[PDB]
Structure formats: C-alpha cells, structure tokens
Structure 1
Amino acid sequence: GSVDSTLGLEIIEVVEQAAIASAKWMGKGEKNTADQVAVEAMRERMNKIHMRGRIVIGEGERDDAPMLYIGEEVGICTREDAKSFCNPDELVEIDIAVDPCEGTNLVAYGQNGSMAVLAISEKGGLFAAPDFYMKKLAAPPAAKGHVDIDKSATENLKILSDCLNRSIEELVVVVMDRPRHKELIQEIRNAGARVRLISDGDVSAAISCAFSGTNIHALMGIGAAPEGVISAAAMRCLGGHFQGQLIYDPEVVKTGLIGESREGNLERLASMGIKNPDQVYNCEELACGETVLFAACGITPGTLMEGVRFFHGGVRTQSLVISSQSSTARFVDTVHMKESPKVIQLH
C-alpha cells in the first residue's frame, strides 16, 4: 500500500502530548527531565498508532538511549501479535525522525524557541543523519535555488535582497550565538542585515524563514545535523530553501569527545556508509521520499508557535502540521478541556 493519509492528522496528538508533558518543566532547571517526559509521551502516543515505523533520528544508538533510539520499532503494526489488525496501508514501512524536546535548555530556563517535533517518510525517505554538526542555509520559497550554501553570506544576502524584493537592511538573519559563528556574524552585520542571535533551537529558526510574517528571512551557520533533516522535511513540503553540509573538522567546531580529529571522524563517517563527507545536500535529498510529513508543537513560546499554557480548567497548545500528501500546512490551536471550564477563551 501507501503511507496512510490519516497519519498526517494523527501526528497532531503526538507532538501535542509530548509538548504538554515537557512544558510542565518550564523554568524548573531540569533539561534532562524536560527531555525525558517528552520522549516518553511521544513514544507512548506513537505506539498507539496503526503504523509500522522505524526511528532513524532519535535519542541515540540502541545502547545509549532506552527510548526512541535509532532502529527502534514504533507502532501497533510493528508487533507480530497485532499485525493481523492492521490494513495494508498501515503495514507500509515508514521511517521516523523525532526530536521530542528541541531546546532542552530553553525549556529548563523557560526561554522562547522550543518545540516537540517529528518528521515521517516511507522507508529510506529521510536522511539518517549522524550526530555531527551541520552547516545550514535556510531561506523562503522565493529564494529557493537562488541562494546557495557555498556562496558567501554577503552574496546570499544580496540574492535574498533581489528575491524578497527588499533591502539588505530590511532582512533579518538568525544565527546561533556560538564562538564558531564570530566571523560569520560580523560578515552579516557589515553587509547591513539585522540579526537574531539564538541560544538554542535552530529548527524553529530554519522553518520561520518559510512564512512571510515572521520577520525572519534566513538561517545561516552551523547547528546539529539530525535537526537539519527534520527542518528540511518541513521546507521540502513548503517549497522552502534548505541546504546542509556535514561538518567533521574539530577545528571549525568540536563535538567535545576526547578523540578528537578530522581523520578520526572521517573514519567513523566512512564506516557509517557516508561516501562523500563534504557532500552538500539540498532539501529534497535530506527528505527524499515520496511522502513527507512534519509535525511540531510549541513547548515555550516561539516564532511559529505559541507555547503551552496552563489555566484553570485546561491547557492550550499550538502545532504546525505539514503533509506533502495533502499538500497542506495546518496550524492547530487546541484547547484541551480538562475539567469542565466555566470560561472558554476564543484565543
């Protein structure tokens, strides 16, 4: 069969529950608990779906991460005892990329920009990125294919200028506040563009480029690779620009392991089946399948989505769900009515 049309809706509840869980730890100074409860909620809700999924991006390798590890099977239809209950569409093998708590320290500190997020494609349709750093360029649909990761920041800004029909001074670039980004940040400033420095969470940033209204027009710089794939899934559905390139030279940025060399990482990467380490991937290559689904729900408030709010009588969440199948981008504002609220606010 083919990826069940219905899955594109069902993931709403996946990211919603994971975000609600993690959001209870907002500002409580426990990034690992914030992460853990989101992992658990996401895993529980996924296992209630009639699907046949494999984690290809997640919390770690099988023996580092107990839940949502790479290779893990999730979905009612992965159980031999239950397979008989699944229809042919539900039995289609799909690959899943999860990030139950994007911005664990954002949550721990109660700062903006965190979310519970996942992407899905049929088997093989999502790049199973290693836990390496990744050089990224995200930009809006109007700049897609025009800007390019190999060009300088200065040139890309000029191109964005022409594509978005506005001055460089009327552009905003998001860059992670990291020592690895000093020269880059300086270059963008000298070119005339405004900047947002973020402490964490460059999935939100990348995707914010797609929507006129966010006052964010590009993401430049190095973040984490698994995150990049998840971002690219959103951007491929939205027609947004997203390119990535693995960084493995510890001179540029370091993972922190006591290794710790370009040769060593090159060795690990080769043995992971990555033939060209310096390869540039466009958005269609990082998320390559025939069907791509993406779901995010805000934990703390952010550019695309409101944060989780707890009030007398319930919870309110905001999610963004994108499906290449229905070709839709849905914002879902959910009032979770917990104990018969006497007042229900419109917004």
Structure 2
Amino acid sequence: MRRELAIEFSRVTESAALAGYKWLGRGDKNTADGAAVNAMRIMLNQVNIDGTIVIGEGEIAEAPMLYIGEKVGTGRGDAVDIAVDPIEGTRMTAMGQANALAVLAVGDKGCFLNAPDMYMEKLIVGPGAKGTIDLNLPLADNLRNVAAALGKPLSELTVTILAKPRHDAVIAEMQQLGVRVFAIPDGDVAASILTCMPDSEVDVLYGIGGAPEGVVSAAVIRALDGDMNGRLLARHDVKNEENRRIGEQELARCKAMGIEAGKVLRLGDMARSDNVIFSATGITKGDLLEGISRKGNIATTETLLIRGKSRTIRRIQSIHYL
C-alpha cells in the first residue's frame, strides 16, 4: 500500500519542478530554490506518510523549510525517511541551462544514512557490474574489473566525473589508462543513474561530490540493482586552514552522529533496504529527463518514477492544464 503512494510522490516532484521552472532564466538562484522548496513541502504535507527529512536543505538554523529532522506528511501511514533535492541544478535554473531537475526519495524509517553536509568519494556502476567494485582497491583495478564484468575493452569504458580542479589528477590518470571520460559541469545525482540506463554510454561514475547527494544516489542505485561504494572525506583532504576549520567540524559532526569518515561504505551502509520510491521530474532538458515545455495554458513534465520493490521503471509524461 506504499506502492499506492508512488503517484503521489511523482506529483510532489512535478510541483517542485514547475515552481522552479517559473524562475528559469531569471538570474535568481535563491528565489528559484525557495519556490521549489516551498512547493515540494506543501505537496509532501498532503501525502499520507509520517515523514522525517533525513536529507534536505540544511539544519534548521540555515534552512527554515525542509530542514533535517522536519516532519512532513499528514502523519497518517508509515513512518518513512525522506530525502529531498527540490532543485538539483539551481545555478542552471537561474541561468536557463540544461540538467536542472527536482528530486525526491522515500524509504523505510532508518533506511538512509544521515550523512553530514560534507564530501563523499563515490564509485557507482549499473546492474551488469554489481558485486565487482571496492573502493579499498585502486581506481585502475576497479575500472578493469568493471570493464571485464561489462565485457568490453577498457578503452571503451566510459566514466563520468565532476569537472572540478580536485579531479584533474584522476581525469589525467583515467585518460592515460585509455578510458573515455565524461566530465560534467552539473551535479552527480542524475549522472549516477545513467550507469543503469542501457541507452546511456556512461558505465561508471567516479569521484568526489556531496555526501547527502551520495545517499540519494545509493537509494536509487539500490532500487535499480546496481552498486555503489562511498567514502566520507573532510574538507582539508579535498580542497588549507579555513578548510580544516570547516573540515574538523565535519568530523566532529561525524563522530557524534555516529559514523567514521575515511572508511568505505558499501551500498547497504547508505541505503539499508530495498523499499525506496525515487521520483525525479525534469526542469530543463538533460541526459536523464526532458525539460518542462509550456505553450500558453498547457505545461508538460517528464518524471522518472522508480520503486525498489519491483520489476518496473516508469517514465511519466504529464500534460498539465495550468
């Protein structure tokens, strides 16, 4: 009867996407965010769940809505963990650029790792390479094992990774290795799912991104029967002295939370059961989803709707009579 809620959750990302779409090309990241946050909360508060925000906009001091620990839903139905990413791609919404989307994941109570807002090294693959990765092994070793599971030469293997200065050395190493490297400007949530889409060239995601985004990836990767490892990393091992100010408070938040940074998290350490509903609606067109189009009174959305308990991946094209 939680599968009965799947449609309800797709309405939540549809509303959030449409609200961020109103601010497309308007040069205001905060107002576009606020609109999508606003709309996602409103909509969640009408769904029959007793949700706790486990991944969200920030702590209450910084985020007055969808803060970590916030209760959402009507309070009927199951106690559920909630992960929200109201706009994945806020900069691009403000700039009228590709790859903005609205994201939500719902799991069993206690399903999502409560990671602090810090960096996480990620390594993600699809179903055909499940059980063949380990971040305790060298990258090159990992890529070779993945290429063999996928049954392709290493030179064909496609690794997507965030285009950031921290990734220069590893990009040079992968290229030197003969791997194809898709260095993306955006963010790593949508990109991780490509590892599981047969029609994407992307086989693997590797690299350092946000820890909360990582758990959202872990939940959908789990639902899609792929694989992932992560590793939490404090700021000064990634990007100093202002970086160890903000980086020692990340390990402080870790210790009293209570997990250890620097240790390898397996898929099951991040997403703990298979009972995940994942919904994502495109705002602008990207690799995963089409964008919103509006011709006067009618808007269209595409939503990817994934349920862990099952044998079906849905793409829902909705025509909205605004």
TM bin, normalised by shorter chain, reads over 0.9
Specify every segment of 5 or more residues in structure 2 that has no aligned partner in the other structure, as ranges: none
**Closer/same/farther in 2, CA of residues 324 and 185 from structure 1, 3 Å limit:** same
Per-residue deviation, 1:174? 1.0
Per-residue deviation, 1:137? 0.6
Identity of aligned residues (%): 42
Query: What does residue 116 of structure 1 align with?
Result: 102
**2:129 is the alignment partner of 1:131:** no
**2:143 is the alignment partner of 1:157:** yes
**2:276 is the alignment partner of 1:278:** no
**Closer/same/farther in 2, CA of residues 251 and 257 from structure 1, 3 Å limit:** closer
Whether the 8 Å contact between 1:173 and 1:218 is mirrored in structure 2 is: yes
Whether the 8 Å contact between 1:23 and 1:107 is mirrored in structure 2 is: yes
Give 2:170's match in structure 1, choosing from 171, 177, 184: 184
**How many residues are aligned here?**
322
Query: What does residue 10 of structure 1 align with?
Result: 8
> Residue type matched to 2:153 in 1?
S
**2:71 is the alignment partner of 1:73:** yes
Per-residue deviation, 1:157? 2.2
Aligned equivalents of 1:162, 1:280: Cα separation in 2? 23
Aligned equivalents of 2:235, 2:68: Cα separation in 1? 24
Query: What does residue 60 of structure 1 align with?
Result: 58
Per-residue deviation, 1:326? 4.0
> Residue type matched to 1:33 in 2?
T
Give 1:267's match in structure 2, choosing from 243, 249, 252: 252
Per-residue deviation, 1:264? 4.5
Give 2:280's match in structure 1, choosing from 296, 316, 321: 296
Per-residue deviation, 1:173? 1.3
**2:234 is the alignment partner of 1:236:** no
Query: What does residue 50 of structure 1 align with?
Result: 48
> Residue type matched to 1:14 in 2?
V
Whether the 8 Å contact between 1:8 and 1:321 is mirrored in structure 2 is: yes
**2:24 is the alignment partner of 1:26:** yes
Aligned equivalents of 2:145, 2:98: Cα separation in 1? 30
**Closer/same/farther in 2, CA of residues 254 and 315 from structure 1, 3 Å limit:** farther
Q: Give every structure 1 segment of 4 or more consecutive aligned residues whose post-TM-superposition deviation is greater than 3 Å.
A: 254-258
Query: What does residue 232 of structure 2 align with?
Result: 246
> Residue type matched to 1:190 in 2?
Q
The SS at the match of 1:35 is: helix
**Closer/same/farther in 2, CA of residues 108 and 254 from structure 1, 3 Å limit:** farther
Aligned equivalents of 1:40, 1:249: Cα separation in 2? 30
Whether the 8 Å contact between 2:118 and 2:250 is mirrored in structure 1 is: no
TM-score by length of 1: 0.88
Per-residue deviation, 1:207? 0.9
Query: What does residue 83 of structure 1 align with?
Result: none
What do residues 2-35 of structure 1 show as CA deviations (whole Å, max 9, x unaligned)? x622122211101011011112222222111221
Aligned equivalents of 2:6, 2:309: Cα separation in 1? 8
CA RMSD of aligned residues (A): 1.9
TM-score by length of 2: 0.94
Query: What does residue 316 of structure 2 align with?
Result: 332
The SS at the match of 1:246 is: strand
**2:199 is the alignment partner of 1:213:** yes
Give 2:271's match in structure 1, choosing from 279, 287, 291: 287
Specify every segment of 5 or more residues in structure 1 that has no aligned partner in the other structure, as ranges: 78-85, 339-347
Larger CA Rg, structure 1 vs 2: 1
Aligned equivalents of 1:254, 1:234: Cα separation in 2? 35
